[PDB]
Subunit: 444 residues, 3 copies
């Protein structure tokens, strides 16, 4: 059951520690989602880089909805009539649905269609807003993150004909600063010093993100769509329809802004017919479309969520990330690193350009384990020139079936082509080649 | 007095230089704010990574203020009266306080409150703007930076029972490109080659920043608050009230924009009472709040200033940054690296979540020096599981009292918990544990 | 003709591969635009890091123009006249130049200049838009990139008194993830494993970019200027004048927005004289200025283009970038690395602060090759303190004349100063010093 992970083929650098006036270190690079194994001269010590996370501080929060809008207008032929005035309809709310918010607009200087030729009619409206399908979202401002690696340390013994887990701990290490060090084992003999070369290869930009909220205010996967900061009131972007301290929704500064967004005009004054539109985005009917979550659209994002109910940090878990630098240090004793052979029976897949322009090789490896080297060819011919080389990693100790996404450079354009896969150290004779089809989704 | 810094425990890699058809290098990683020491086989050579700076080019500048606003309105009952017209009050400045700027607005189609029932009154206003407390700020657009490390090289001799500084130079090295090399010592025997793994762990985003300015235009610590670029005229953001080539302030395109931002309505025409507001942000009274400087709110920022009076570059000094890669190269001779022991008597502190959502351990170490390894526990019990491990560095050669900020991952939530500190290489018996209290400031 | 590149002086680290239960690697850092050479113990194997590219996915596209604008207005003295009404001129297009787009505006409540004192005139306009000089541009939204290094591998034999190229291949390697490996030579004996320390030192921010388009929709060098996203309709930014599925240009939501951007007022009603302006940016006459391409203004950008006619990815080629980490691995045999001597006859140049605040040393080296170490001095005196040290690389095997841009830190302010250059390993006696002039272009 509990077994060592695939032990990765790793070059080891022996570094000598500086002298104390009154010591060898084993240095190596470790890949995200991979493990490195060693014995101390007996337990098999394994270190797996399990996670790469950005912890973004949340500097603003507000709750918003998507309004369902209806405008009800009345026309008056006589400009001097007590019905329809700037008093009652210019910069004022409708007089007192409990969930509705209602703002008034005034349109004098209308054309006398349905009136006398000497009349200058006036149109007066109530612009009603209700939350569409009672949807609620939390808007958050995310700022520059702190970075953390999660390592899983596990020591194994092979007794009674099976591997047995002798010790297991999760280790957390901040990556933005200098070398971070601590004891690895329960006996405190081995230490793990973690050094990042620099900032994680990917990062979510500073700005506005959002999550759908439940009745209890429970959040989910973060989404990105043009969204107002707390101090912004741009009607082309999300967040102009906000919930107050009570669960009541309002058009942000609606009393004053209504005359800027509500566009209306008389068709026939007597018939009480008129033209009316909202000059804004993100409302119902017909002006709202919800983006899919960040994790669905970004191959590099495994997850992007708000950490807990205190709503202080958002955590982005990376599916892709550069290697970390490790230094293993310690009676007189020697460390020996071990790796497992890599293997592959077959593969299948396709070359994809998705609706967001991600150019990927969607790959499934069969009965595979460890380091798999791949070559993308110029055409369908297995002997045609190589235009791209990559390496995929399968962390399972035993031959497993696994699906993965391999980013592809732009040179890998339209059309079917050959892709050849080969397990690390295997001869060219043991490569697997297949003609792989191309599928391009239009930009949506 | 002038003494070597704490010599950091450093793993050294011996690299062999490629052959010239017609040479050993000492390689190591160096942490920001730390020093590495060596002897050449006698002077004690010390290299300290003193600074990490981003030099951002300034691509736009303009001077702005915070206006103090007052609207003075007059009402006229008779729509055809020569008093209050589109001629005199629509898209025009007030006729000619020397520092004031005055823009006019026109509101016809008013309700006859205080007039006859057949009247259609008109309201006319003067909207006056003055600089609040004569405050001046420089808006700057900062673009992608160039990166520089500052090293302090200092060679020491121990004669007459004391250390004496034999040589000292400041060394500057660009980090964005390839390996940068130069001679270290006065005798030109030792060379320092600096290689960054990649871009500095933190960076100030491209965009608009600002500084308060004095009478002489002297700048200070940079601040970040939504602010218009030179070509933008968004009234929800700072910078719409700009100073011209003379020290005169104007509402940017005020003559044309006034009718969009000034919202007014008659209360009683005869009584000369009316409602009036400005639909904009960042003005007085009651619509202005100044953000604290970037250095105060961002733990990673030690300083963010405009370099000099030419106003061409902004310099961001980093409080946190990844390690740099060093190669020391050179008659036949050998380099020996030395380190000092690490020590700690005690510590105090608290776990803090500030008003900007920075999750930190505010730490004070007592009589400490060198490398200090810390463990954050699951609960108040000193033997409860470790949820986070970190390392702090104290660069003082002698036991010193120092305060520092340690970023914490989100798993370190609410509540008091134990934190244990231990100097590098000390036995578990020499660790110091304390129950540390939690304090969370609400989001402001 | 076809000759090896300059073989760079490189420190080599020998790493030992982990053991397989059933192997030495040669590790080194390689600089962008440089080459490393070795022999296997005979062919001279050369690896050149030729390119660093970001492949940005394009998530939005739209075609836009720069409108040439003309407003034609008519005044009517009598407010009740059938000529000039809200019906015909408020929120409507002009009635049906084939390329023109025409939107109407209505301005009642005018002052009776040229009318009777009891008249309340009305102004009616046609606001016409045509594409200025038939210019077309493609707006693109660029998102976070994938990173690729291009290596040129070339093996040389020296027979018949000349170098002869025995093999040459271009190698592509993704940098965002883990170690990428493949065979280097035709015989598959040597392998090249590429590891990036982290994300490329520079990156183009997520956002809106544009390119001029030809008749066939052919793109060119990308430019950056405030530009609307597809869902934005901000008149202070580019892209509000868009081309539809036919080659026809429209003011985005022009029918509704016209009353917000067209500002007009009667001068004399009878004379048919009036004031008229567009409250917007990026139109002709007098309100349009085109930024120079990204590659021209950013020293770090060699090129920034749309890859091909499918318009799915934009490719940014970097002129500056950090080193990559290489591991060369393989019968029992040994790898020996070789380098060429560095040389320089003379140099010329100037210190420049351009119109975009880039602080650079514009340098020309004469009869130079390899590694050139430079020192920037405090004053004009050749013996004055060094305020900055840098290293430039010339990849040509033979002494060549080459121009380059060296970024300078802000400490290198105004005024003439000495700069001293010296080829790697040359004695201080062989340095070349010149007093170098300062030229600062004002901020434009
Ligand atoms: C992956 O690599 C590790 C080495 O890094 C392999 O570990 C080896 O596991 C075998 C058992 O599978 C151990 O062999 C011996 O087993 C007999 C009982 O059959 C026992 O009497 C011996 O004392 C011994 O334990 C061997 O010690 C162990 N090697 C090391 C260096 O730890 C592992 O088998 C590899 N896994 C796969 C799936 O290839
Ligand atoms: C930090 O580490 C350095 C070594 O890296 C220590 O330097 C050592 O300093 C002592 C003096 O404190 C030197 O010892 C000797 O002093 C006597 C006079 O008392 C003199 O006659 C001898 O010739 C000799 O200089 C010693 O040479 C020096 N060691 C090295 C390798 O440089 C330093 O003491 C440490 N500092 C602290 C505060 O622990
Ligand atoms: C740059 O460095 C390389 C070494 O890394 C130099 O390569 C050397 O090239 C010479 C020829 O220029 C080779 O020498 C010999 O030439 C004679 C014929 O004149 C021939 O009979 C010998 O068998 C031999 O090839 C030498 O082997 C080669 N060295 C290596 C190690 O490859 C190159 O000359 C340098 N270039 C410059 C411009 O300095
Ligand atoms: C949910 O929507 C319904 C109408 O569909 C409404 O009656 C109800 O009050 C809304 N829920 C809340 C919590 O307001
Ligand atoms: C990749 O292919 C698998 C089938 O092997 C499919 O289930 C999966 O959804 C595909 N993923 C993408 C991103 O195309
Ligand atoms: C400063 O403010 C005062 C009023 O408080 C004003 O009289 C003075 O002119 C202002 N200073 C300048 C330099 O304009
Ligand atoms: C940290 O604690 C010290 C007292 O030891 C205090 O002076 C300092 O202001 C605190 N800093 C922060 C950021 O909380
Ligand atoms: C180009 O501009 C001319 C006027 O200068 C116009 O006649 C022509 O129709 C425009 N070209 C296209 C393709 O519309
Ligand atoms: C640098 O100087 C050369 C002349 O040696 C000139 O042709 C080139 O345009 C200059 N480049 C810059 C960016 O100033």
């Amino acid at each position: 059951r509990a077994e060592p992970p695939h032990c990765s083929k790793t070059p080891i650098v022996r570094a000598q520690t500086s002298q104390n006036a009154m010591g060898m270190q084993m240095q190596f690079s470790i890949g995200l989602h991979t493990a490195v194994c060693f014995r101390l001269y007996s337990l098999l010590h394994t270190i797996r880089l399990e996670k790469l996370e950005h912890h973004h501080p949340i500097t603003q929060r507000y709750t918003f909805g998507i309004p369902e809008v209806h405008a009800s207008c009345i026309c008056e032929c006589d400009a001097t009539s007590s019905t329809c005035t700037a008093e009652s309809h210019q910069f004022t709310a409708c007089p007192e649905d409990e969930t509705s918010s209602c703002y008034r607009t005034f349109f004098p200087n209308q054309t006398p269609i349905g009136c006398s030729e000497d009349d200058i009619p006036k149109l007066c409206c109530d612009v009603r807003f209700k939350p569409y399908k009672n949807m609620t979202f939390l808007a958050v401002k995310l700022e520059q993150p702190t970075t953390y690696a999660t390592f899983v340390y596990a020591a194994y013994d092979f007794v009674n004909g099976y591997w047995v887990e002798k010790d297991k701990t999760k280790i957390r290490s901040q990556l933005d600063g200098g070398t971070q060090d601590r004891h690895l084992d329960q006996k405190r003999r081995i230490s793990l010093a973690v050094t990042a070369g620099a900032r994680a290869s990917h990062q979510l930009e500073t700005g506005m993100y959002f999550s759908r909220t439940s009745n209890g205010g429970e959040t989910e996967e973060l989404r990105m769509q043009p969204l107002n900061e707390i101090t912004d009131n741009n009607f082309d972007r999300l967040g102009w329809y906000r919930m107050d301290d009570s669960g009541h929704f309002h058009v942000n500064n609606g009393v004053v802004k209504m005359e800027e967004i509500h566009k209306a005009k008389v068709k026939n004054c007597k018939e009480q017919t008129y033209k009316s539109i909202l000059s804004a985005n993100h409302y119902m009917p017909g002006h709202f479309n919800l983006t899919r979550p960040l994790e669905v659209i970004k191959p590099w994002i495994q997850s992007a969520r708000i950490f807990d109910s205190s709503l202080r940090q958002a955590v982005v878990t990376h599916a892709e990330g550069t290697n970390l630098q490790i230094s293993i240090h310690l009676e007189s004793q020697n460390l020996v690193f071990f790796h497992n052979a890599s293997r592959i029976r077959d593969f299948s897949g396709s070359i994809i350009v998705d609706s967001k322009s991600n150019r990927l090789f969607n790959l499934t490896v069969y009965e595979a384990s460890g380091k798999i080297d791949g070559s993308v060819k110029m055409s369908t011919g297995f002997g045609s020139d190589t235009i791209h080389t990559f390496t995929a990693y399968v962390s399972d100790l035993h031959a497993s079936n696994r699906s993965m996404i391999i980013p592809l450079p732009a040179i890998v354009g339209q059309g079917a082509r050959a892709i050849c896969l080969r397990a690390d150290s295997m001869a060219d004779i043991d490569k697997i080649c297949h003609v792989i089809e191309y599928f391009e989704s239009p930009l949506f």
